[PDB]
Every structure is written in C-alpha cells, then in structure tokens.
Design an enzyme around this catalytic site. Structure first.
Site, PDB file in Angstrom:
ATOM      1  N   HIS A  15     -15.927  -3.142  23.434  1.00 29.54           N
ATOM      2  CA  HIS A  15     -16.758  -3.190  22.238  1.00 29.54           C
ATOM      3  C   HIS A  15     -17.713  -1.996  22.129  1.00 29.54           C
ATOM      4  CE1 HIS A  15     -18.795  -5.153  18.893  1.00 29.54           C
ATOM      5  NE2 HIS A  15     -19.951  -5.027  19.517  1.00 29.54           N
ATOM      6  N   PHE A  33     -29.598 -15.079  18.584  1.00 29.04           N
ATOM      7  CA  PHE A  33     -28.582 -14.182  19.123  1.00 29.04           C
ATOM      8  C   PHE A  33     -28.609 -14.220  20.652  1.00 29.04           C
ATOM      9  CE2 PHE A  33     -25.860 -11.909  16.283  1.00 29.04           C
ATOM     10  CZ  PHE A  33     -25.182 -10.948  17.022  1.00 29.04           C
TER      11      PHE A  33
HETATM   12  C1  LIG Z   1     -17.031  -2.284  16.982  1.00 30.60           C
HETATM   13  C2  LIG Z   1     -18.256  -3.022  16.513  1.00 30.60           C
HETATM   14  C3  LIG Z   1     -19.521  -2.598  16.909  1.00 30.60           C
HETATM   15  C4  LIG Z   1     -20.652  -3.297  16.493  1.00 30.60           C
HETATM   16  C5  LIG Z   1     -20.516  -4.492  15.616  1.00 30.60           C
HETATM   17  C6  LIG Z   1     -19.250  -4.911  15.215  1.00 30.60           C
HETATM   18  C7  LIG Z   1     -18.116  -4.219  15.636  1.00 30.60           C
HETATM   19  C8  LIG Z   1     -16.751  -4.677  15.193  1.00 30.60           C
HETATM   20  N1  LIG Z   1     -21.610  -5.164  15.216  1.00 30.60           N
HETATM   21  C9  LIG Z   1     -22.851  -4.786  15.573  1.00 30.60           C
HETATM   22  C10 LIG Z   1     -23.964  -5.508  15.130  1.00 30.60           C
HETATM   23  O1  LIG Z   1     -23.821  -6.510  14.390  1.00 30.60           O
HETATM   24  N2  LIG Z   1     -25.201  -5.129  15.492  1.00 30.60           N
HETATM   25  C11 LIG Z   1     -25.401  -4.064  16.291  1.00 30.60           C
HETATM   26  O2  LIG Z   1     -26.568  -3.721  16.637  1.00 30.60           O
HETATM   27  N3  LIG Z   1     -24.334  -3.348  16.730  1.00 30.60           N
HETATM   28  C12 LIG Z   1     -23.059  -3.673  16.396  1.00 30.60           C
HETATM   29  N4  LIG Z   1     -21.953  -2.913  16.882  1.00 30.60           N
HETATM   30  C13 LIG Z   1     -22.146  -1.721  17.720  1.00 30.60           C
HETATM   31  C14 LIG Z   1     -22.534  -0.579  16.761  1.00 30.60           C
HETATM   32  O3  LIG Z   1     -22.148  -0.865  15.404  1.00 30.60           O
HETATM   33  C15 LIG Z   1     -21.983   0.806  17.101  1.00 30.60           C
HETATM   34  O4  LIG Z   1     -22.011   1.016  18.515  1.00 30.60           O
HETATM   35  C16 LIG Z   1     -22.837   1.862  16.390  1.00 30.60           C
HETATM   36  O5  LIG Z   1     -22.875   1.518  15.001  1.00 30.60           O
HETATM   37  C17 LIG Z   1     -22.358   3.304  16.532  1.00 30.60           C
HETATM   38  O6  LIG Z   1     -22.833   4.002  15.380  1.00 30.60           O
HETATM   39  P1  LIG Z   1     -23.171   5.583  15.312  1.00 30.60           P
HETATM   40  O7  LIG Z   1     -24.207   5.827  14.238  1.00 30.60           O
HETATM   41  O8  LIG Z   1     -23.450   6.053  16.722  1.00 30.60           O
HETATM   42  O9  LIG Z   1     -21.795   6.311  14.863  1.00 30.60           O
HETATM   43  P2  LIG Z   1     -20.448   5.582  14.330  1.00 30.60           P
HETATM   44  O10 LIG Z   1     -20.884   4.648  13.230  1.00 30.60           O
HETATM   45  O11 LIG Z   1     -19.602   5.028  15.467  1.00 30.60           O
HETATM   46  O12 LIG Z   1     -19.656   6.821  13.650  1.00 30.60           O
HETATM   47  C18 LIG Z   1     -19.631   8.108  14.257  1.00 30.60           C
HETATM   48  C19 LIG Z   1     -19.782   9.223  13.223  1.00 30.60           C
HETATM   49  O13 LIG Z   1     -19.596  10.480  13.893  1.00 30.60           O
HETATM   50  C20 LIG Z   1     -18.565  11.266  13.279  1.00 30.60           C
HETATM   51  N5  LIG Z   1     -17.681  12.027  14.217  1.00 30.60           N
HETATM   52  C21 LIG Z   1     -17.018  11.595  15.309  1.00 30.60           C
HETATM   53  N6  LIG Z   1     -16.315  12.626  15.857  1.00 30.60           N
HETATM   54  C22 LIG Z   1     -16.544  13.715  15.089  1.00 30.60           C
HETATM   55  C23 LIG Z   1     -16.102  15.141  15.106  1.00 30.60           C
HETATM   56  N7  LIG Z   1     -15.268  15.647  16.049  1.00 30.60           N
HETATM   57  N8  LIG Z   1     -16.558  15.950  14.126  1.00 30.60           N
HETATM   58  C24 LIG Z   1     -17.386  15.503  13.165  1.00 30.60           C
HETATM   59  N9  LIG Z   1     -17.802  14.230  13.125  1.00 30.60           N
HETATM   60  C25 LIG Z   1     -17.400  13.327  14.062  1.00 30.60           C
HETATM   61  C26 LIG Z   1     -17.753  10.297  12.435  1.00 30.60           C
HETATM   62  O14 LIG Z   1     -17.269  10.942  11.253  1.00 30.60           O
HETATM   63  C27 LIG Z   1     -18.723   9.166  12.125  1.00 30.60           C
HETATM   64  O15 LIG Z   1     -19.341   9.417  10.858  1.00 30.60           O
HETATM   65  O1  LIG Z   2     -22.693  -5.264  18.810  1.00 25.17           O
HETATM   66  C1  LIG Z   2     -23.227  -6.294  18.338  1.00 25.17           C
HETATM   67  O2  LIG Z   2     -24.461  -6.504  18.416  1.00 25.17           O
HETATM   68  C2  LIG Z   2     -22.483  -7.154  17.790  1.00 25.17           C
HETATM   69  C3  LIG Z   2     -21.560  -7.829  17.272  1.00 25.17           C
HETATM   70  O3  LIG Z   2     -20.304  -7.599  17.632  1.00 25.17           O
HETATM   71  C4  LIG Z   2     -21.865  -8.863  16.301  1.00 25.17           C
HETATM   72  O4  LIG Z   2     -22.289  -9.965  16.701  1.00 25.17           O
HETATM   73  O5  LIG Z   2     -21.684  -8.615  15.097  1.00 25.17           O
END
Ligand SMILES: *Cc1cc2c(cc1C)nc1c(=O)[nH]c(=O)nc-1n2C[C@H](O)[C@H](O)[C@H](O)COP(=O)(O)OP(=O)(O)OC[C@H]1O[C@@H](n2cnc3c(N)ncnc32)[C@H](O)[C@@H]1O
Ligand SMILES: O=C([O-])CC(=O)C(=O)O
Ligand code: HEM
Ligand SMILES: Oc1c(Cl)c(Cl)c(Cl)c(Cl)c1Cl
Ligand code: SF4
Ligand code: F3S
Ligand code: FES
Lengths: 102, 613, 138, 239
Positions: free
Chosen positions: B356, B122
């Site tokens: 992102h 990666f």
């Molecule tokens: C966009 C993206 C990010 C990503 C990725 C691929 C994509 C397309 N791939 C990743 C990967 O392979 N490896 C990695 O380490 N990271 C990767 N990322 C980044 C990452 O997935 C995200 O930054 C991270 O998963 C964020 O997760 P987190 O646990 O912080 O929360 P969430 O999954 O974004 O969801 C938020 C939850 O909070 C609740 N929410 C939001 N607002 C409210 C309000 N007002 N009230 C109540 N609840 C709320 C949502 O319901 C949700 O459950």
């Molecule tokens: O946030 C990340 O690590 C990553 C990501 O988009 C992936 O490669 O799936």
C-alpha cells in the site's frame, strides 16, 4: 454584459407553448384572428429554430453572416405570404378545413 | 546525443510531481511570488492521491474534544519509535490549520449536525495520550477524500502563474558539486529533451509500490524521484519499511478503505471468528496496519482462510445500517461490486494484505530539505527538497498511521514552499549549468530507445515483482531474503539484455515503462538489501528470526539500572542506502532517529515503550 | 498561461499538424433518445420547409387556394393515396409536437433520468402513431 | 481455452503519412483479467508494446482510460470484456478528438475549458481565509452528491454531438456540470457572475438535451440534468 442569450432562450420556450396552445384553439375557434396569430407563431418559432441549426453547422464568419441574412429573408417572405393568404385568400384555418374534407 | 532537441528553461523553483504534495508545494511557491515550474508525467488529477479513500487527520475537536498532542502521541507510537519526533510535532500541530486551509479552498467535506467537518474513527487513534479510548479525528469527503483533495488543490492551482509541464518525464536531477540546479525531462508529447534549471527543486514523485506483484498502487507508482536521488549518489532512508494495507481486494488488488472498520466493519475468517479480538484485545479491528495485516497473514498460515485456492479473508459490512453505508462508504460499494460482484449491504468483501504505502523515501528535514550523510552527521543538500510519500522526514517511522499520508502531503508541501520562501527571494541568481549537463540521461534514454536485447521490459518487471512478493512479504527471514537479494541483483544485470520495440519519438510508452523499470529496480534493490541487513521486528518489518524490537535499551524494564547499547549495536536507527549505478552494488549505513520535538514545553518527547494494541 | 491562451495554443498546434480526428458518428452506438433527437431536427426542418414553401407559393404562384384544390382533383387519387399523402404530413408534425412537449418538460427539469427517457421515448412514439392515424382518418 | 478478438484503432505519428487503421489481436480470456484494460495491458506486455494508451489507477478513479469501446464511452479499467467470443470488440479513441498516437487524444482544450469556469471557491471577503472551517449544513451539502464525484474523464463531452461540431466554443457537459457544482455550493459568493459568464450563443446553449452525456458517464452521473438546472437558473436569476 446583458442577459440576451438567456432571454432569447426563454423567448423560444414561450412561443413554443404559444404555438402548442394555438393548435387546439385553431380547431375549436377557426377565425381570422387565429389565422394571423398562427402565422406569427409558425414563422417566428420556425425562424428561431432554423437559426439554431444555422449557428450549429455553418462554420465561418462570412458564411454565418450570410446564412442568417438569407434565413431572415426566407422568414420575412414566409410571414408576408401567410398574411397575404389570410387577407386576399381562403385563410389558413379554412385552408386546412377545405383540404381535409377531401 | 547531439541529435536530440535540448530545450532550456529558467525558473526560480521546480516541483517534480503534481499529486497532493506536489500541487501544494507548487502553488505555495507561486502564492509566495516565486516563478515556479511543475513537472508531472500524468495529468495532475490522475495522480495516485486521487484514489485516496479514508480521509485526512486533524485534531479539530468536531466530534469529541481533542488535542493535537494526542494525535502526536498516536503517530510516534504507531511509528514504533523510528519516527523523527521533530517532524511529527510539526505535522500534527499544523494539521488543524492545514485541513481548514483545504476546506476553505473548497474541499467538500462531509458535514456534522453543527455544519462542521465530519470526522471519524480510524486505526489506532486515541484520546488523552492513549487513555481516553478511541478518537474520531479522521476528516473526510464521504469516501473519496483523496479524489476531492486532489481536485480542489488542482482547482486552486489554476489561480496562480505557475507553469505546468504535463506528461513530462523527469529523467534525472541537474546536479553540480553536490548542489541541485534543476531537472532534465522528456516531453512525452514530441519526445524532446528539456533541461529546466531552478534555484530550488522539490521532489514529490510518490511511492514505488509497483515493485511488487500485488499492490493497491497506480501503475504509475514507480519511485522515479527516489531513483533520480539514487542516481545522484544520495541516500534513501528506510526503504525496507513497506506498508501492507490489511484490506485490499482479492482480485485486482484494489483498496477497500480502513474507514470500513472505522465505521464498525468487522474482519472474519473461515471459522467465523472475529479474530481481531483475540489477536488485539483492546483496539480490536481498529488497530495498527502492521498488527492487523500480521494477524490476517498469520490466520492464513493456520489454515483458517476463505476462498478457492485458499488465500484470503472476509471484511464484513452488512450488519451496519445500509443507509449509513450509503453516506459514509459510497465509493467502495461500486468497486466491491464492479471488481468482486459483491453487494456491500448483503455479503462480506474478500480482502488480502497487499502492498500500500512506502514510508521509506528520500531523507528529509522537518523543513522539507533533503539530507545527505557526512561524517555520521546530517548535511542539507543545497537547493533540493522532498515531500509526500516520495519523501522521508519519517513522520511515519516504521509504520504509517491511517489517514496520515494525505496530511503528510499538504503539511510538507507547504513546508517546502515556506523553506524556500524564507531562505531566498524570487528573481535571485539562478545558478548556471554545464553545456554538457544531463548528457548521461539523454544517452541512457537513446540506449533504451533502440534496445535489441533478449528480455521484454514486461518480462523482467514481472520477475522483479514476483521475487519481491515471495522474498519481501509481511513475514521475513534471512534465508529467503538473501536468496531474494541475489535474485534481484541478478535481474539488475539483465537490464542490458532488454528488448524494446517502439522506436518513435511521440508517446513512446514502451520506452518510458522501461525507464520506470530502471527506476523500480534501484528501489527494490535498496528495499530488499535494507530488509536483509535489519535484524529486528519493528513496525511493518517483521523478522521471523529476530522477533524482538532491538532498541538502545530494553524499555520493557525500567531504564537506569541498565547500560545503554552503542549506536552500531542496536537497531533503533534509520537505514540509509546507496547503490552503484553500474554494478548494482548496494552499500548502506545509518543515522540516528530524532527524539527531541520542536519544543519540550509544548510537546513532550515520548520515550520508547512496548507497542501493542 | 491563461485558459484562453491555452485554447488559442490548442488550435494553432493541431491545425498545423498531420494528426487525424478520431471517428464519431460512423462508430458511436445509436440509442433511442439519440435517434429521437435528430428526428426532432429533421421534422422541424421539414415542417418549416413545408410552411416556407406554403407562404412563398402564396406570393409567387397565380390562382387562389380553391383553384389549386380543383387542380388537385385532376387525376383524382385513390382514398388510399390521399390518406397516404395525408398521413405523411401529420406524421412529421405529430412527432415534433409530442417530442416538443417532452423538450419542455425537460426545460422544467422533470424526467431527465435515463430510464425515464426510455419511458418518455416510447410514449411519444406511440402518441405520434395514434395521433397521425387519428388525424389522417378525419 | 477461450480466445477473444480485439479490433483496435492504430496510428503512428512517426511513420511518414501512416493512415489510421484497425489492428486485430487475440487473447486467451482464461489468461486475462476481467476488464478491457487487462486485455489492453496483456497485448502491450506479450504481443505488441508499440500500442500506446493512457492508464493509471485501474480502479476507475483517475479517469485515465476513457475511450470508445463497442460504440460507447467508458473506462477500459472498469468495462468488462464480453465473454461472447463471436463478437469482436472494437476499441477506438474518444470521438471527434485529435489523435496524438493510437488511443491518445489531445485533451488540452478539454482542460483549458475547465480552467475557464474558474473551478474553485470564491469569497467576496478573503481576508479571513485559512483560519476557520466554513459552516455548511448536511442539507446544503447533500446538494453536491452526484456533482463532486466527477473524474474529468471526458467520456461525456466527447460523446456529445454538439461538442463534436462546436467543441471550441461550446464548453460541453463535464465542464458545464462542474460550473454548476460551484454554482450551488453554499460557500461560494460568485453564483451570479458564474451564470453571467454563460451569456453567449455557444458556452451553454449548444446543448440540445441530446442526453448522450448522462447516458455514457462511467460514474453514473447526470451531467445533462445539471445543464437543465443551469438553464433554469440562467432564466430566473436577478441582475
Ligand atoms: C494506494 C492508496 C493510497 C492511499 C489511499 C488509498 C489508496 C488506494 N488512501 C489514503 C487515505 O485515505 N488517506 C491517506 O492519508 N493516505 C491514503 N493513501 C496513501 C496516499 O494517498 C499516498 O501515499 C500519497 O497520496 C502519495 O501522494 P504524492 O503527493 O506523494 O504523489 P502521488 O499522488 O503518488 O503522485 C506522484 C506525482 O509525481 C509525478 N511523477 C512521478 N514520476 C515522475 C517523473 N519521472 N517525471 C515527472 N513526474 C513524475 C506524477 O505525475 C504524479 O503527479
Ligand atoms: O492510506 C490510508 O490512510 C488509507 C486508506 O487506504 C484508506 O483507509 O482509505
Ligand atoms: C406542435 C407544436 C410545437 C412545439 C411545442 C414545438 C416545440 C419545439 C421545441 C421545444 C424545440 C427545441 C428542442 C431543442 O431544444 O432542441 C423545437 C425545435 C424546432 N421546431 Fe418546433 N414545436 C412545435 C411545432 C413546430 C412547427 C409546426 C414548425 C415549423 C414551422 C417547427 C419548427 C422547429 C424548428 C425549425 C426547430 C429547430 C430544430 C432544432 O434546433 O433542434 N416546430 N420545437
Ligand atoms: O447535430 C446533431 C447530431 Cl450530429 C446528432 Cl447525432 C444528434 Cl442526435 C443531434 Cl440532436 C444533433 Cl442536433
Ligand atoms: S460527468 Fe461522468 S463522463 Fe463526464 S467527465 Fe465526469 S465522470 Fe466522466
Ligand atoms: S450529450 Fe449533449 S447537447 Fe446536452 S444533454 Fe448531453 S451535453
Ligand atoms: S485507469 Fe484510472 S480510470 Fe481507468
């Protein structure tokens, strides 16, 4: 906890191949034995089958109890009738035969 | 007000958000015998973590031999030394324990010939503290890692007596004299108002990427917790550091994993050159996010771009064994087709650097505790925690390392769990709240609910997004930024000129997508103003007018025959931002980075250096 | 809250509401294997009704099979009306026969892919026709 | 310039005995993204924001859309609009389900059913958990492809006539396919008790191999084929 549901499932598949195999055998070997074992396989498999349709569509506890009770009665008379026919009448293999050269 | 049905709830803990981070925190508390509540505006499984593709980092030593301290070194380096090294130490150490937890939970990781968790290459990860070349420690479930992670976590969570308020919209925190008392939420199902009071509160609401016109984020990535924090008068750390993922699809802006490059995928411009070979000789295509996207976005400046309107680049995959592409990258193959009509095994995917990840967020302990800033010093906010993308313990600093967010999630999810587990007991005195509390939220709700203004929620949101896109992109200058600032502050004023149509109680998606715009504004406001003030080029933040890294020293030459710059004169420091809710006035200040790890003997501090790949 | 409590809650909430059930049969697009499925139901129901009516009339109605056959030779039907009444008895039977075989191949797990259902659907449909015409010709 | 028509199910629970009715909208397709959701969003934004629906990923992984489009169940965000201006697209909520509002079905039961199969790994000895990664050969691992990718979108179960008539007691394909996903997981110790939990008339056996489920999965999975695999296991297992 028994495995009653899964045995009844298999039971069905068995009488199905039994009934599938009994058709050529009734043509190839039309007899009184065939006439009876066809009557068993016909009524059982049919009874189980309509039972499925009963469970599916008959919502309610009163209704489900009755619909199965009458279905049992229907299948009992259907088997008794085919046994009567095989004994005091033509017999079902010969009945089809007579009906087909017609 | 008064006409709304206010329902009260008493718990030991409350977790806002059920993504990876939220769920881990939520059953973690329950696991420890705490009467926990979870609040999430989506069905847990719908959360954005479910879209995660590449994988989850840990130095398990499955591919080659490994040391979590090498992982540490990579992370702090990648952070361009804005990263708090106490947290990075914690995270990278807890990583192998954490991944093994997930696998043990049921996570169906892809396997090696030894029947161990398959890891892969990666962006910008190395062996032997940057010396032993490329490292393969990104643990994955083929291509759908986040999906599998979130599902197994959700699976696990059914096992404990946690209470899940599904599709509930958290409006604000319940605060009393600088102490967090719980949350106040909207039950989307009937439109009723719920005040959940708990001794401890964990905010895990994910990123706010939807402040931009083009992003790989879910429509539901709206910085709702971030904003609740801002509405409390609490600081938000480093909001200007916005991650531009190099490879997102040209059309709708869907993500194509960095695992494409990790498996040997190459990036090619209109001239045909592997431009990630002259832009970054050593690490090449598998370099840092900011450097790669910087190169891409720079390649379009030259004119050597590919497409119709002339505005994207080509990610190549066809030279790889198609059999390999089937096992390693199945999820992108559908979407590359579906959203681009591209056969992965024949033609190169059309990609573009798009928003992102948000390394900015709520300031945090390495313990998960939310920090305020009192007298140039850190002060723990009683009964309040944050974890995941919504949080900023800044384990990611100025640039987050690929496959580190999913790690961030589970690590600190568990941290918040334990911090509470150790700090108090279940059944402890859950603090009281005023009969008047949260009245402000209900009022702002009702105001928005019947809004007869001049501008559509949709129209104002589009103004914000296109403004941020043209004024806070991969490259930045004070001229464009200042115009961008006043632009956003102007739009903030328009929030009393907004038109809503739906006036129902049940599932008023009109109303909430507005509360979300409120939320997004507060976020973008701080992002752009923070970006304005910072006059250097660190990590994701690149200024055309200040091309250089402004540190306390000049770490290019040796440090000693050299005088140290004072705090408020160099830029190697965390941005803290606030905003007056009424005027939209962003005031801001600074706190120091942490360089001391949790133990110098176990994990050496890594001093700043020239950061290049 | 248990899975069972959740279900129990789901029913008591909804039955005491004014929420409409979304349309289903009236809107859901029919496909070859979908139609061939209710037909298996119908043909079975018809076939059992036939057999039930046969054994029940054997218990209640006076006169033997031979009596009823001569009874039928009354106003004797055209060859192309005895064949019709003949074909409309082997068609319900021959269909349910071939599809029943398909249902067993399925119970074995073979051929459960969609394109295989469009292949096994036609083949049963043709075998029905060929064996329904084949038998009414005897 | 290309106008397209969209016939869309509507119902407002707060409009005093409002009756379910179709509402039609018109969309310039040159002014819209390729997918049905893009249109659903565009009418929300520009035309009517009283239109209520579930969306999130717009990438087909959250399984948030999942509605009835032109007779079939897929994900709006993934289904592309028919360029054929002559056909009027008909958008409905997921079949035989309680509408909360517009295209928003009460999925509580669907979820409760998923809980009931206990969709997580179980060991007989859980003392050693958390400390070593479990062994599993790629061979044992291949047996999971096309099972783990389930999005819980509920397109399948909500297309199954058996689930229509018996959704309360019949678990439906989505859930059932998952119980199987855990059955064939080499690392699970509870295969026998997972089967033993399906020993009743309704939980598994209301499946009559109709095959709508597989026919409709927006993810190209085969829930039905797994249902038959469970059935075999149900007949042949010991104790
Ligand atoms: C966009 C993206 C990010 C990503 C990725 C691929 C994509 C397309 N791939 C990743 C990967 O392979 N490896 C990695 O380490 N990271 C990767 N990322 C980044 C990452 O997935 C995200 O930054 C991270 O998963 C964020 O997760 P987190 O646990 O912080 O929360 P969430 O999954 O974004 O969801 C938020 C939850 O909070 C609740 N929410 C939001 N607002 C409210 C309000 N007002 N009230 C109540 N609840 C709320 C949502 O319901 C949700 O459950
Ligand atoms: O946030 C990340 O690590 C990553 C990501 O988009 C992936 O490669 O799936
Ligand atoms: C020709 C040989 C036959 C075979 C191999 C056969 C096999 C089957 C099979 C495998 C099913 C279950 C399909 C499912 O899972 O939904 C079935 C259904 C049924 N069959 Fe037959 N069958 C045959 C003839 C008959 C006859 C002559 C009758 C009339 C007595 C009959 C009555 C039924 C009924 C009532 C059902 C239940 C319908 C349903 O639940 O879908 N069958 N058959
Ligand atoms: O009950 C059923 C309904 Cl409604 C349909 Cl549409 C089909 Cl195809 C089948 Cl097989 C059964 Cl059992
Ligand atoms: S099997 Fe397919 S249709 Fe059913 S819930 Fe899963 S992804 Fe959706
Ligand atoms: S739609 Fe149906 S009854 Fe069985 S094969 Fe599929 S679940
Ligand atoms: S919105 Fe995520 S699947 Fe359609």
């Amino acid at each position: 906890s028994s495995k009653a549901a899964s045995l009844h499932w298999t039971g069905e598949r068995v009488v199905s191949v039994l009934l599938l195999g009994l058709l050529p055998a009734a043509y190839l070997n039309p007899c009184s034995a065939m006439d009876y074992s066809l009557a068993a396989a016909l009524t059982l498999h049919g009874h189980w089958g309509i039972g499925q349709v009963v469970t599916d569509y008959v919502r309610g506890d009163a209704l489900q109890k009755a619909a199965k009770a009458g279905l049992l009665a229907l299948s009992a008379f259907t088997f008794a009738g085919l046994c009567y026919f095989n004994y005091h009448d033509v017999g079902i293999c010969k009945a089809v035969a007579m009906l087909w050269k017609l | 007000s008064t006409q709304y049905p206010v329902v009260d709830h008493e718990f030991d803990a409350v977790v806002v958000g059920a993504g990876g981070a939220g769920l881990r925190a939520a059953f973690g508390l329950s696991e420890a015998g705490f009467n926990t509540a979870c609040v999430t505006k989506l069905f847990p499984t719908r959360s954005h973590t479910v879209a995660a593709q590449g994988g989850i980092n840990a130095a398990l030593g499955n591919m080659e031999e490994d040391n979590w301290r090498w992982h540490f070194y990579d992370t702090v380096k990648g952070s361009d030394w804005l990263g708090d090294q106490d947290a990075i130490h914690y995270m990278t150490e807890q990583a192998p324990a954490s991944v093994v937890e997930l696998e043990n939970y049921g996570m169906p990781f892809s396997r090696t010939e030894d029947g161990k968790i398959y890891q892969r290459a990666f962006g910008g990860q190395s062996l032997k503290f940057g010396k032993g070349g490329q490292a393969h420690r990104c643990c994955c479930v083929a291509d759908r890692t986040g999906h599998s992670l979130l599902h197994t976590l959700y699976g696990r969570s059914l096992r404990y007596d946690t209470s899940y308020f599904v599709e509930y919209f958290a409006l604000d925190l319940l605060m009393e004299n600088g102490e967090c008392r719980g949350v106040i939420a909207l039950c989307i199902e009937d439109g009723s108002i719920h005040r959940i009071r708990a001794r401890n509160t964990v905010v895990a609401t994910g990123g706010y990427g939807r402040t931009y016109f083009s992003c790989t984020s879910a429509h539901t990535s709206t910085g709702d917790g971030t904003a609740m924090v801002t509405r409390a008068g609490l600081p938000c750390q480093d909001l200007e550091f916005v991650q531009f993922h190099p490879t997102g699809i040209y059309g709708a802006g869907c993500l194509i994993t960095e695992g494409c490059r990790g498996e040997g995928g190459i990036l090619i411009n209109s001239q045909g050159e592997r431009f990630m070979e002259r832009y970054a000789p050593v690490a090449k295509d598998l370099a840092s996010r900011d450097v790669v996207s910087r190169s891409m976005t720079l390649e379009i400046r030259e004119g050597r771009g590919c497409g119709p309107e002339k505005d994207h680049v080509y990610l190549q995959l066809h030279h790889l064994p198609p059999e390999q592409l089937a096992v390693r990258l199945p999820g992108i193959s559908e979407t590359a087709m579906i959203f681009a009509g591209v056969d992965v095994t024949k033609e190169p995917i059309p990609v573009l650097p798009t928003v992102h990840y948000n390394m900015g967020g709520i300031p945090t302990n390495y313990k998960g505790q939310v920090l305020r800033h009192v007298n140039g010093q850190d002060q723990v906010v009683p009964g309040l925690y944050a974890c995941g993308e919504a949080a900023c313990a800044s384990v990611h600093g100025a640039n987050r390392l690929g496959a580190n967010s999913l790690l961030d999630l589970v690590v600190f999810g568990r941290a918040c769990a334990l911090s509470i587990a150790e700090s108090c007991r279940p059944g402890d005195k859950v603090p009281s709240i005023k009969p008047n509390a949260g009245e402000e939220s209900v009022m702002n709700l009702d105001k928005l609910r019947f809004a007869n203004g001049t501008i559509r929620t949709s129209e104002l949101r589009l103004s914000m997004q296109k403004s941020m896109q043209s004024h806070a992109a991969v490259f930045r200058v004070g001229s464009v930024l200042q115009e961008g600032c006043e632009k956003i502050l102007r739009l903030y004023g328009d929030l009393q000129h907004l038109k809503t149509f739906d006036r129902g109680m049940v599932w008023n998606t009109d109303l909430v997508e507005t509360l979300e715009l409120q939320n997004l504004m507060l976020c973008a406001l701080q992002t752009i103003y923070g970006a304005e003030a910072r006059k250097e080029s660190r990590g994701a933040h690149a200024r055309e007018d200040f091309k250089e890294r402004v540190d306390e020293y000049d770490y290019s030459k040796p440090i000693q025959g050299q005088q140290k710059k004072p705090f408020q004169e160099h830029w190697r420091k965390h941005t803290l931002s606030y905003v007056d809710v009424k005027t939209g006035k962003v005031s801001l200040e600074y706190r120091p980075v942490i360089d001391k790890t949790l133990n110098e003997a176990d994990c050496a501090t890594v001093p700043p250096a020239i950061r290049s790949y | 809250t248990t899975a069972k409590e959740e279900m129990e809650r789901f029913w008591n909430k909804n039955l005491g509401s004014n929420r409409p059930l979304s349309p289903h049969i009236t809107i859901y697009r029919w496909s070859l294997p979908m139609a061939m499925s209710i037909c298996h139901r119908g043909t079975g129901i018809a076939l059992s009704a036939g057999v039930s009516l046969f054994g029940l009339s054997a218990l209640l109605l006076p006169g033997n099979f031979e009596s009823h056959l001569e009874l039928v030779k009354s106003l004797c039907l055209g060859p192309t009306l005895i064949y019709t009444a003949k074909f409309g008895i082997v068609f319900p039977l021959m269909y349910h026969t071939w599809n029943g075989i398909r249902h067993l191949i399925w119970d074995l797990g073979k051929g459960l892919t969609i394109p295989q259902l469009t292949q096994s659907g036609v083949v049963v449909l043709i075998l029905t026709v060929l064996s329904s015409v084949g038998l009414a010709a005897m | 310039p290309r106008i397209k028509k969209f016939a869309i199910y509507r119902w407002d629970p707060d409009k005093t005995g409002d009756k379910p009715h179709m509402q039609t909208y018109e969309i310039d397709l040159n002014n819209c993204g390729p997918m049905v959701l893009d249109a659903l969003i565009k009418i929300k934004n520009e035309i009517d924001s009283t239109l209520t629906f579930r969306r999130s990923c717009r990438e087909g992984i959250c399984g948030s859309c999942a509605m009835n489009i032109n007779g079939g169940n897929t994900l709006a965000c993934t289904r592309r609009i028919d360029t054929n201006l002559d056909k009027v697209s008909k958008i409905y909520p997921l079949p035989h389900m309680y509408v909360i509002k517009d295209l928003v079905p009460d999925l509580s039961n669907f979820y409760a059913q998923y809980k009931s199969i206990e969709p997580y790994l179980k060991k007989k000895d859980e003392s050693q958990e958390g400390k070593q990664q479990y062994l599993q050969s790629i061979e044992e691992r291949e047996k999971l492809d096309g099972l783990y990718e389930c999005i819980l979108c509920a397109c399948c179960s909500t297309s199954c006539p058996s689930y229509w008539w018996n959704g309360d007691k019949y678990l439906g394909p989505a859930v059932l396919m998952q119980a199987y996903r855990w059955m064939i997981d080499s690392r699970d110790d509870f295969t026998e008790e997972r089967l033993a939990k399906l020993q009743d008339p309704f939980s598994l056996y209301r499946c009559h191999t109709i095959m709508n489920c597989t026919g409709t999965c927006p993810k190209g999975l085969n829930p039905g084929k797994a249902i038959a695999e469970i059935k075999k296991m149900m007949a042949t297992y010991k104790e």
